[PDB]
Design a protein around this ligand. Structure first.
Ligand code: ADE
Ligand code: ADE
Ligand code: SF4
Length: 225
């Protein structure tokens, strides 16, 4: 299947089966999408929700987060693990307060310059909260694209990561980008799982090479040896 059919099938699936009601998806702003993306990169949705709610209630705005003591941020992070994310969250909130006058940057370069925010998280912040035309590529999306397009090779090799970023760019639409990017994350998280993917519940099952060859185990490639 062509890039235009990938996008259309994923958006039609999201419409009927996607997750649309999580708290970071309601009255989306750059700040809320950033906060949730950072919490979500190493923690599952069920554990993140109470923390997302407590952080939004305590820190309504990024300036509130910036002005809080770091020890108060770490105390409220307790239970989420991977505390470098919390230290960078706080540094990034202070960078928005100092460089961007308390308003979360809405351009790619300034968002990706924030501590703890990579190319995929910056693309996620801007595409999901403002509908800007940016692709994402976290572990879950890497798996969906690598299986659908048979991208063998370890994504830790620059050549394979570039291939996967090119594929993401090719299948990501401008129209409906916020719905498409959330749907790709949902598919990788819930359908195209690391083991035994639920191919029969996947909107890409008619064109996916791994589903046609029952070779999901080969994609993406793991680290050598
Ligand atoms: N917005 C999101 N929804 C679900 N899983 C995610 N993983 C990272 N970001 C996510
Ligand atoms: N199906 C699965 N879902 C999530 N993590 C996994 N690790 C191995 N198999 C998995
Ligand atoms: S058809 Fe199966 S292997 Fe292919 S993208 Fe969907 S869940 Fe993953």
């Amino acid at each position: 299947m062509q890039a235009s059919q990938f996008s259309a099938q994923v958006l039609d699936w999201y419409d009927k089966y996607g997750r649309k009601t999580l708290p970071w998806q309601i009255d989306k702003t750059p700040y809320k999408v950033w906060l949730s993306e950072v919490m979500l990169q190493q923690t599952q949705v069920a554990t993140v929700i109470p923390y997302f709610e407590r952080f939004m209630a305590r820190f309504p705005t990024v300036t509130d987060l910036a002005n809080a003591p770091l020890d108060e941020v770490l105390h409220l992070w307790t239970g989420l693990g991977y505390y470098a994310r919390a230290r960078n969250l706080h540094k990034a909130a202070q960078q928005v307060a100092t460089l961007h006058g308390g308003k979360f940057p809405e351009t790619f370069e300034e968002v990706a310059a924030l501590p703890g925010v990579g190319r995929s998280t910056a693309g996620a912040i801007l595409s999901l909260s403002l509908g800007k035309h940016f692709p994402i590529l976290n572990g879950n999306v890497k798996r969906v694209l690598a299986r659908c397009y048979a991208v063998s090779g370890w994504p830790g090799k620059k050549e394979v990561e570039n291939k996967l970023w090119s594929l993401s760019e090719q299948v990501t639409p401008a129209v409906g980008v916020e719905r498409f990017n959330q749907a790709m994350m949902d598919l990788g998280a819930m359908i195209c799982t690391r083991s035994k993917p639920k191919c029969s519940l996947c909107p890409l099952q008619n064109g996916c090479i791994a589903a046609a060859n029952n070779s999901w185990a080969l994609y993406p490639g793991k680290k050598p040896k």
